[PDB]
RNA sequence: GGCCGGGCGCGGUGGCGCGCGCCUGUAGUCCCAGCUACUCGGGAGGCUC
RNA sequence: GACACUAAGUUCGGCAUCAAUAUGGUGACCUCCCGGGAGCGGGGGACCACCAGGUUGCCUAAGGAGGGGUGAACCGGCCCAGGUCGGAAACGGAGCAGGUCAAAACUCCCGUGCUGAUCAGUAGUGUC
RNA sequence: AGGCUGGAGGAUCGCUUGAGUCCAGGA
RNA sequence: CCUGUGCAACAUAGCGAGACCCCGUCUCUUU
RNA sequence: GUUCUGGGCUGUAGUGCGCUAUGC
RNA sequence: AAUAGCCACUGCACUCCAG
RNA sequence: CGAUCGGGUGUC
RNA sequence: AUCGCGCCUGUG
């Protein structure tokens, strides 16, 4: 029941039809499922990385380009896990904003 | 003929993992 | 012509009076030329030549005239 | 497959390599071991004696005594004998424009099962098989094939109780015509022991239907008994080819290695499982080398 | 001078021979009486003549004719 | 001259005669243990996968005197073939290397 | 005692005889060199008063 | 008869052929939402290109919404085997090869404007 | 020796053979 | 048409007067 | 120094009511 | 006022012969 | 510098 | 052009 977050969703180098889900203004260079998980897990979000899954609209097969990330929004009872994270859009955006800060990118 | 043709065909399938 | 005519005239004089006429014949070897003349001291008929072919007839005209004088 | 005899024929041969050069005396000891393994694998005593004698001569002819590695020469010779013993060159029924085959054997032979396996095998080779339950006495027998055909997607015509051969021929010919069948498989009645009356009826059917092939299905786990039956069926009805079923459960392999000499019939197929796909063409070369690990 | 038939011819031959280098040889013929003819020859120095009668004209003319023809070869 | 289409065709003929396969085991002269075991089903599935990769190639690449060369000069082509056949870039270079070794021996044949 | 040829040109000599060239006569000329102040040499034939 | 001039006929060549609009499409791209565990299902705005037949500018000497072609390894659009990806599955997606095309692009032939040359020598008029 | 007549064996003078020689002149 | 001076190293032609010479006749006794 | 007279259709021009004839 | 023939005179090219 | 000029035909 | 286009006529 967790939700799905594919890097294509947060890629500013992709068009709409190519899988982008957020405005280019907020999108990111080349987000990696890893980075996505690393910023989500570090906010109190319950999430696990599906390293080998591949996004259907992703012609490339490389690594930097594949993997999937799963985050728990609601809890079995119904309450959101983190009030500040209603929707999926909420997480996508939060991620798009925090990755360009990861030390590994400011390097 | 049957040897190589069949053996190359065989050796190829094994080596190519996908 | 000249010679054939000439003789006629001469033989005319000889006949007219064969006792008053005479006939001279002048041979000049050097200058090389012959010359016959028949006159009657009242008619000088003369004929000169230098060519060789003319001696024969001149000599005959001479020999003849003589024969009419001795006939 | 024949792990038992395999591991057995192994120690015998592997007992010569690390020696380096061998004496005739050591060769005779190996041959005796080999000969015992064959007998213990229920191989016709006659076939077994001939086998080892053949290996002996061939071995000597290959200058085994004059070899820095005899174990290998003995391997090649023994592999050649097994290959020949198994049938030599692989064979398979020759298909024509239209084919009609009979499946015969005793009960529990794997006959009916093999019947569907053949229909399925040739169905994947571009054929349109028709299965027919020829048992005119037992409805439960035709029912077992009706189910199988229903499992392999192959139509099945069940004869009637006591139906005549002519009636069966007419009916079968018409169906094949209307359904465009090119391979017609006739599963005949399976009984516990040879039933003379049945053989008569099978002979008459054979006469009325005129099958291109008459495959006798023998359960390999019955050993040499399967060969005495093969002779009985050949003398009473007439066999053209053999099918060795339950070879996956065959630990000895006596019937397989003896069919050639004993029956003189070719083994076309081998049953390797109770599943409709558990069939494959008999490959003497394969088994020979397999038994030795080649 | 008056010569005899012969004589005259020899004297005459000379007149030509005595004039081959120069001078003129004259000869005049004439009917004469006081039948005969008077024949005269002169080189200018010496004179000579003869009297020819019908009795000898043939014999005389024979030699006289050869004489004139032979001695007069000197023209063109 | 051994092209990639030529290799494609040989693969078709080899797969076709595979079943058949029973009769072949019933003929002597092939030494001991001819086709046993048992790796004829896996071996054929391999040829079929190589065929699907060549299905992503075009006529120029298939009929080229040296199909491997056409991809050395235009490595962009390798990427396309891989995309269309659901295979990786390395898999296509592997096929190309195998084709190279195959064609070498065919002229040595 | 007269005559035996005439004409023109050149040459010779104090002069005469005379020499050369050309022209031209009668029935009717030959020979010789001489003469020594000279319009003047010598011999032999023929014709005529 | 012989020449001229206007109208004009034949043929092979050359040069050249707008703009701005509504309605409906196709495509591309962006931007907002709802639903959903994925592949997605659903709905609102914006921009650009092109197409179908339809106007008008007050537009040029002409300028028709004509008819083909090619479509490129990929790099136009569709349909997409296989394989690939998401899915337990049903299915769905990206998509090469292959096929295809009112609607990427690029190109011909039409027509239509001037325009050399050619051939005809008719139609009229004029001259001597 | 003289006189007369005739001639015709290299013409001195005069005259003329039906306008002799047609070279020169009459710009 | 008229006028004009010459007609060779014979080579006008004719006539007349008539520059050796040749033939015939007469005389040699007679204002 | 451009035409004295006569004759010769050689050719051209001008003048002479000039005269004769017009496929009997 | 048409055509042909006849001749005569003058001029030019400008000719030839005779006085 | 040959008269009249007109008429008819072929009427460019 | 014979662009006075050509031909005939009559002025006894």
CATH number for position D26: 1.20.120.140
Distance from CA of A60 to the nearest CA of F (A): 8
CATH class of the region C1-71:
alpha beta
What is the spatial distance, in angstroms and rounded to an integer, between the CA atom of B6 and the C1' atom of H37? 47
Q: In angstroms, rounded to a whole number, what is the distance separating the alpha carbons of residues A40 and A81?
A: 12
Please answer yes or no on whether F14 and B10 come within 8 Å at the CB atom.
no
D102 vs A16, D50, D114, CA distance in Å?
66, 33, 11
Give yes or no for F105 touching D (CB within 8 A). no
Q: Looking at chain A, which subunits does it touch, using at least 3 CB pairs closer than 8 Å as the criterion? A: F
Q: How many CB pairs under 8 A join C and E?
A: 94
Range of the domain at D123: 91-281
- The approach used to solve this structure was cryo-EM
Q: Which of B2, B10, B18 sits opposite F43 (nearest CB)?
A: B10
For the residues of chain A, what is the DSSP string, one character each?
--EEE-GGGGBTTS-TTTT--S-TTT-BSS--HHHHHHHHGGGT-EEEEETT---TT----SSTT--EEEEE-B-TTS-BSSTT--SHHHHHHHHHHHGGGSHHHH-
Please answer yes or no on whether D92 and F29 come within 8 Å at the CB atom.
no
3-state secondary structure chain C: CHHHHHHHHHHHHHHHCCCCCEEEECEECCCCEEEEEEECCCCCEEEEECCHHHHHHHHHHHHHHHHHHHC
Q: In angstroms, rounded to a whole number, what is the distance separating the alpha carbons of residues A2 and D159?
A: 60
Q: In angstroms, rounded to a whole number, what is the distance separating the alpha carbons of residues D285 and D79?
A: 9
The SS3 assignment for F56 reads: coil
Residues D33 and D137 in one domain: no
The secondary element (H helix, E strand) that includes residue D270 is strand D267-271
Residues 43-72 of E with CB under 7 A from strand G: 44-49
The secondary element (H helix, E strand) that includes residue D184 is strand D183-187
Give nearest nucleotide to C44 (CA–C1').
I8
- Answer yes or no: is D12 within a domain: yes
Q: How many residues does chain C have?
A: 71
Work out if E21's Cβ lies within 7 angstroms of strand G: no
Scanning every residue of chain F, which has its alpha carbon at the shortest distance from the alpha carbon of D283? F25
The secondary element (H helix, E strand) that includes residue D53 is helix D45-61
F13 vs D35, F10, F20, F48, CA distance in Å?
43, 5, 12, 12
Q: What is the dihedral of CA D248, D253, D256, D258, to 10 degrees?
A: -170
Q: Given D90, D109, D132, which residue is the final one in a domain?
A: D90
**Burial class (CB within 10 angstroms; exposed 0-12, middle 13-18, buried 19+) of C4:** exposed
Resolution, rounded to a tenth of an Å? 12.0
D224 vs A69, D249, D255, CA distance in Å?
64, 15, 5
Give yes or no for F82 touching A (CB within 8 A). yes
Residues D129 and D35 in one domain: no
Q: Given D62, D90, D118, which residue is the final one in a domain?
A: D90
- Answer yes or no: is D292 within a domain: no
Chain G: nucleotides under 7 Å from a protein CB?
20-31
| CATH fold label, A1-107 | Phenylalanyl-tRNA Synthetase; Chain B, domain 1 (3.30.56)
Residues 40-69 of C with CB under 7 A from strand G: none
Q: For residue A20, which phi and psi values (nearest 5 degrees)?
A: -75, 135
Q: In angstroms, rounded to a whole number, what is the distance separating the alpha carbons of residues D80 and D58?
A: 10
D183 forms beta bridges with D99, D129
D267 forms beta bridges with D242
Residues D81 and D95 in one domain: no
The secondary element (H helix, E strand) that includes residue E71 is helix E57-71
Residues D147 and D24 in one domain: no
CB D102 within 8 A of CB D209: yes
The SS3 assignment for D109 reads: coil
Q: In angstroms, rounded to a whole number, what is the distance separating the alpha carbons of residues C23 and C37?
A: 6
What is the domain-level CATH number for residue E38? 3.30.720.10
Map out the domains of chain F with their CATH numbers: 1-107 (1.10.260.30)
Q: In angstroms, rounded to a whole number, what is the distance separating the alpha carbons of residues D11 and D33?
A: 9
Q: In angstroms, rounded to a whole number, what is the distance separating the alpha carbons of residues D144 and F71?
A: 58
Measured distance between the N- and C-terminal CA atoms of chain D, rounded to whole angstroms? 14
Q: Looking at chain E, which subunits does it touch, using at least 3 CB pairs closer than 8 Å as the criterion? A: C
Q: How many domains is chain E partitioned into structurally?
A: 1
F49 vs D117, F12, F42, F71, CA distance in Å?
28, 12, 11, 19
Please answer yes or no on whether F89 and A59 come within 8 Å at the CB atom.
no
D245 forms beta bridges with D219
Scanning every residue of chain F, which has its alpha carbon at the shortest distance from the alpha carbon of B2? F14
Residues D64 and D103 in one domain: no
List Cβ neighbours of D181 (8 Å cut-off, separation of 6 or more).
D128, D129, D130, D155, D175
CB D69 within 8 A of CB D183: no
Range of the domain at E8: 1-76
Work out if C20's Cβ lies within 7 angstroms of strand G: no
Distance from CA of C67 to the nearest CA of E (A): 8
Spell out the domain ranges in chain A. Answer: 1-107
Q: How many residues does chain B have?
A: 18
List Cβ neighbours of C43 (8 Å cut-off, separation of 6 or more).
C13
Q: In angstroms, rounded to a whole number, what is the distance separating the alpha carbons of residues A33 and D208?
A: 74
Comparing CA positions, the residue from A81, A73, A66, A71 lying closest to residue A34 is A66
Distance from CA of D74 to the nearest CA of F (A): 13
């Amino acid at each position: 029941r967790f939700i799905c977050i594919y890097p294509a969703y947060l890629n500013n180098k992709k068009t709409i039809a190519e899988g982008r889900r957020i405005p280019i203004s907020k999108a990111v260079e080349n987000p990696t499922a890893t980075e996505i998980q690393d910023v989500c897990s570090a906010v109190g979000l319950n999430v696990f990385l599906e390293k080998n899954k591949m996004y259907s609209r992703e012609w490339n097969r490389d690594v930097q380009y594949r993997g999937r990330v799963r985050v728990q929004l609601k809890q079995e009872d119904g309450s959101l896990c983190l009030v500040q994270f209603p929707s999926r859009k909420s997480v996508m955006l939060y991620a798009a904003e925090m990755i360009p800060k990861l030390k590994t990118r400011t390097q | 003929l049957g040897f190589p043709i069949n053996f190359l065909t065989l050796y190829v399938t094994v080596q190519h993992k996908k | 012509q000249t010679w054939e005519e000439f003789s006629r005239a001469a033989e005319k004089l000889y006949l007219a009076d064969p006792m008053k006429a005479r006939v001279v014949l002048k041979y000049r070897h050097s200058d090389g030329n012959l010359c016959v003349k028949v006159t009657d001291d009242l008619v000088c008929l003369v004929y000169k030549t230098d060519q060789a072919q003319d001696v024969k007839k001149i000599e005959k005209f001479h020999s003849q005239l003589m024969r009419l004088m001795v006939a | 497959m024949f792990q038992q005899l395999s591991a057995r024929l192994q120690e015998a041969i592997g007992r010569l390599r690390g020696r380096g050069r061998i004496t005739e005396e050591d060769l005779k000891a190996t041959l005796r071991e080999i000969r015992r393994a064959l007998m213990d694998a229920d191989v016709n005593l006659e076939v077994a004696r001939d086998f080892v004698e053949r290996v002996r001569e061939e071995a000597l002819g290959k200058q085994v005594l004059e070899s820095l590695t005899p174990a290998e020469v003995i391997l090649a010779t023994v592999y050649e004998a097994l290959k020949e013993a198994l049938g030599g060159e692989a064979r398979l029924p020759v298909l024509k424009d239209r084919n009609l085959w009979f499946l015969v054997g005793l009960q529990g032979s794997g006959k009916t099962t093999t019947a569907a396996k053949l229909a399925l095998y040739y169905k994947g080779k571009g054929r349109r098989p028709l299965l027919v339950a020829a048992d005119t006495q037992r409805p439960a027998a035709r029912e077992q094939l009706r189910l199988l055909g229903e499992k392999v997607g192959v139509p099945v015509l069940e004869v009637m109780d006591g139906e005549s051969p002519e009636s069966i021929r007419r009916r079968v010919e018409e169906k094949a015509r209307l359904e465009a069948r090119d391979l017609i498989l006739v599963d005949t009645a399976g009984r516990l022991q040879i039933d003379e009356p049945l053989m008569g009826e099978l002979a008459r059917l054979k006469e009325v239907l005129g099958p291109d092939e008459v495959l006798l299905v023998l359960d390999a786990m019955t050993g040499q008994e399967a060969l005495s039956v093969a002779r009985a069926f050949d003398e009473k009805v007439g066999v053209t080819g053999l099918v060795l079923t339950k070879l996956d459960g065959d630990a000895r392999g006596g019937a397989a290695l003896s069919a050639r000499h004993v029956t003189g019939k070719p083994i076309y197929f081998a049953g390797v499982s109770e599943k409709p796909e558990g069939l494959e063409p008999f490959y003497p070369e394969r088994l020979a080398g397999r038994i030795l690990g080649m | 001078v008056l010569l005899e038939s012969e004589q005259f011819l020899t004297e005459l031959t000379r007149l030509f021979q005595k004039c081959r280098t120069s001078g003129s040889v004259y000869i005049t013929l004439k009917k004469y009486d006081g039948n005969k003819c008077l024949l005269r020859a002169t080189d200018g120095k010496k004179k000579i003549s003869t009297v020819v009668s019908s009795k000898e004209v043939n014999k005389f003319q024979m030699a006289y004719s050869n004489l004139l023809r032979a001695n007069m070869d000197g023209l063109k | 001259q051994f092209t990639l289409r030529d290799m494609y065709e040989q693969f078709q003929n080899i797969m076709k005669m595979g079943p058949f396969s029973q009769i072949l085991g019933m003929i002597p002269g092939f030494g001991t243990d001819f086709m046993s075991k048992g790796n004829e089903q896996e071996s054929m599935a391999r040829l079929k996968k190589l065929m699907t990769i060549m299905d992503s190639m075009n006529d120029q690449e298939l009929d080229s005197t040296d199909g491997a060369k056409v991809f050395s000069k235009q490595p962009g082509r390798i990427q396309r073939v891989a995309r269309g056949s659901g295979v990786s870039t390395r898999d296509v270079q592997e096929l190309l290397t195998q084709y190279t070794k195959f064609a070498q021996m065919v002229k040595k044949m």
